[PDB]
C-alpha cells in the first residue's frame, strides 16, 4: 500500500494476457483500452509487482509479482511480454517512450532482486 510500496515508474499501455487455449491475446480484465501501469517496490522486503489500472474506469487489470530471475522479452519497441507459471502477460505501449520507461524500471528491478 501507500506506506510500504513506492512507484518506480508509470507507463501507458494496453495490458493483455495470452489465451493459449485459443492462441490469441485477450484484454486484461475483459475490455480493450489503455491503462496506467506501475512497477511498485516494497522497500522493506525488496519485492516488486506490476499494477495497472484502466484510464477510463480505474479497473485493476494486472497485479502480478515480479520474481527474481524473470525473463522479460522486448518483442518489439512497443510490445513487451513476460510469463509466470500461470499466465503470459503483454504490454502494448502507447509510445516508444512509455516502453523505454517501463523496460528500464523492469530491468532495474530484475538487477536488484
Amino acid at each position: 500500500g501507500s506506506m510500504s510500496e513506492q512507484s518506480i515508474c508509470q507507463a501507458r499501455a494496453a495490458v493483455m494476457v495470452y489465451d493459449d487455449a485459443n492462441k490469441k491475446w485477450v484484454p486484461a480484465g475483459g475490455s480493450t483500452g489503455f491503462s496506467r501501469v506501475h512497477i511498485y517496490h516494497h522497500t522493506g522486503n525488496n519485492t516488486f509487482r506490476v499494477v495497472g489500472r484502466k484510464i477510463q474506469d480505474h479497473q485493476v487489470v494486472i497485479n502480478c509479482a515480479i520474481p527474481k530471475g524473470l525473463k522479460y522479452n522486448q518483442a518489439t519497441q512497443t510490445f513487451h511480454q513476460w510469463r509466470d507459471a500461470r499466465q503470459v502477460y503483454g504490454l502494448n505501449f502507447g509510445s516508444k517512450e512509455d516502453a523505454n520507461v517501463f523496460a528500464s524500471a523492469m530491468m532495474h528491478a530484475l538487477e536488484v532482486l
Partner: peptide, 4 residues
C-alpha cells in the same frame, strides 16, 4: 488499490 489492491493488495498483492
Amino acid at each position: 488499490x489492491p493488495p498483492x
